[PDB]
C-alpha cells in the first residue's frame, strides 16, 4: 500500500436532505473503522474557497483499498457551477435523498445535470431512514429514484440504494454506522477506478507551429493524454479537413525523444505537412479517436455579476466566442423554446453552432468570452454534428 487508487466522489441531492451530514458521518465512521482524518457536520457545512466563486468543502477518507476525495456543497447554486465548470471532480456521485421528503426537485435537477456533465456513476443513499418505521413505503421512495435515475439514463434498476441515517451513524449508533460502511463498499465495488491520462488515446492541443524544409512541419504543446511514439500515425483535427501524417520525431528542450507523454510539453514533426495546413485550434490525435464538429448541445453557466460576469442579460442572436483548449472560436446560439433572455448567474441548455469546426466529444469543457474577457462557462453535453 501507501498510495493507492485515487477516486473523486461527491454528495448531491435536494437541500437539507443530509448531504453534509453524510460527508461528516463518512469521514468519521470511516476514520474510526479503517483509520484516517475524521470530520463533523458543523465544520463541513462551511462554504469557503474557489477558483475555476463556488461554496465548497473538501474531505479525504480511506478504505482498505482506496483513497477518496469527497466534495460537498452548501447549496444547489454551488453544485451547478461546479459540475458545469468541472471544478468539482466526480468519478462517482452519492445521491443523498431523505426518505422523509422523498425525490424532490433539486434531486431530479442533479441527476439531470449529472448526465449533462459526464458524472459516470451514481450511488444512492436513502437517508433520514430512521424517521420512517414503514417497510412498504421506503419501498416506493426507492422505486421513485430507480424510475427517476432511469429517466436520465442511469441504471436505476441496478443502482445501489442504501437505507441509512447520516445522523444515527454519525453520532455513534453503530447499528446505523454499518450503513456508512456498506455505502463505502459500493464506492469500492460500484465506482470503477478512473483511467489515468496516459491510458487514454493520444490528444495534443497545438500551441506553436513552424516548418522544417526537408521533413515538413513541427507543432508544439502539452500532451493532454495518451502517448505519441515516434513513427506512429496521427491526425490534425479542427478548422480544416482532417489530415493524416506520421510522427517522424519528438523533441523537448532540444533533446530528441523516442516518445512524448501526457503531462509533457513537446515538439512533434509532421512528415509532409506544410505550415499553412495548420491552424490554431487544431489538435494532434490518435487517428480516429476524435472528430471535428461544428454543432453541439451544451449546458452553460453564465457568470453572475458578483463573479465578475456581465452586469446585463443577453438575448437571441447573441454571438460570443467559445474558447476551446487553445483558441476561442465564434458561434451562434439557439436558446430553449420560449427563452428570451439569459440573465447573469443563470445556467441553461444551449445549442451552439461554430463558424469553424473543433475536435470534440461529450464532456469537453469550454469558456464563453467577450473580448478575451470570460463571461461564461460550459461543457459539451452532446455533439450534434
Amino acid at each position: 500500500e501507501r498510495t493507492k487508487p485515487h477516486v473523486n466522489v461527491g454528495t448531491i441531492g435536494h437541500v437539507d436532505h443530509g448531504k453534509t451530514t453524510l460527508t461528516a458521518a463518512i469521514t468519521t465512521v470511516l476514520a474510526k473503522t479503517y483509520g484516517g482524518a475524521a470530520r463533523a457536520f458543523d465544520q463541513i457545512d462551511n462554504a469557503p474557497e474557489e477558483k475555476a466563486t463556488i461554496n465548497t468543502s473538501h474531505v479525504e477518507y480511506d478504505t482498505p483499498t482506496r483513497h477518496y476525495a469527497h466534495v460537498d456543497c452548501p447549496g444547489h447554486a454551488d453544485y451547478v457551477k461546479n459540475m458545469i465548470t468541472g471544478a468539482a471532480q466526480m468519478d462517482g456521485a452519492i445521491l443523498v435523498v431523505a426518505a422523509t421528503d422523498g425525490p424532490m426537485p433539486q434531486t431530479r435537477e442533479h441527476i439531470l445535470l449529472g448526465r449533462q456533465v459526464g458524472v459516470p456513476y451514481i450511488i444512492v443513499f436513502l437517508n433520514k431512514c430512521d424517521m420512517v418505521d414503514d417497510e412498504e413505503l421506503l419501498e416506493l421512495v426507492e422505486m421513485e429514484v430507480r424510475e427517476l435515475l432511469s429517466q436520465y439514463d442511469f441504471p436505476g434498476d441496478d443502482t445501489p440504494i442504501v437505507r441509512g441515517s447520516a445522523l444515527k451513524a454519525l453520532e455513534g449508533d453503530a447499528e446505523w454506522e454499518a450503513k456508512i460502511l456498506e455505502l463505502a463498499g459500493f464506492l469500492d465495488s460500484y465506482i470503477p477506478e478512473p483511467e489515468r491520462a496516459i491510458d487514454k488515446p493520444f490528444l495534443l492541443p497545438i500551441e506553436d507551429v513552424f516548418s522544417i524544409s526537408g521533413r515538413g512541419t513541427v507543432v508544439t504543446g502539452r500532451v493532454e493524454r495518451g502517448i505519441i511514439k515516434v513513427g506512429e500515425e496521427v491526425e490534425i483535427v479542427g478548422i480544416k479537413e482532417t489530415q493524416k501524417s506520421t510522427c517522424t520525431g519528438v523533441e523537448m528542450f532540444r533533446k530528441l525523444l523516442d516518445e512524448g507523454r501526457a503531462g509533457e510539453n513537446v515538439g512533434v514533426l509532421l512528415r509532409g505537412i506544410k505550415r499553412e495546413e495548420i491552424e490554431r485550434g487544431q489538435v494532434l490525435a490518435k487517428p480516429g479517436t476524435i472528430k471535428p464538429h461544428t454543432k453541439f448541445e451544451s449546458e452553460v453557466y453564465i457568470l453572475s455579476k458578483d463573479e465578475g460576469g456581465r452586469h446585463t442579460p443577453f438575448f437571441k442572436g447573441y454571438r460570443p466566442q467559445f474558447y476551446f483548449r487553445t483558441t476561442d472560436v465564434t458561434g451562434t446560439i439557439e436558446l430553449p423554446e420560449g427563452v428570451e433572455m439569459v440573465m447573469p448567474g443563470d445556467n441553461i441548455k444551449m445549442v451552439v453552432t461554430l463558424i469553424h469546426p473543433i475536435a470534440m466529444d461529450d464532456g469537453l469543457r469550454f469558456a464563453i468570452r467577450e473580448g478575451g474577457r470570460t463571461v461564461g462557462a460550459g461543457v459539451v453535453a452532446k455533439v450534434l454534428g
Binding site: 500551441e207 506553436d208 513552424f210 522544417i212 521533413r215 513541427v218 508544439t220 504543446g221 502539452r222 517522424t248 520525431g249 523533441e251 523537448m252 528542450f253 532540444r254 530528441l256 510539453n265 513537446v266 515538439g267 512533434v268 514533426l269
Partner: peptide
C-alpha cells in the same frame, strides 16, 4: 524546436 525549461516549443 525552441524551449528549454518550460515554454512551448520544439524541434524535430
Amino acid at each position: 524546436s525552441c524551449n528549454c525549461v518550460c515554454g512551448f516549443c520544439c524541434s524535430x
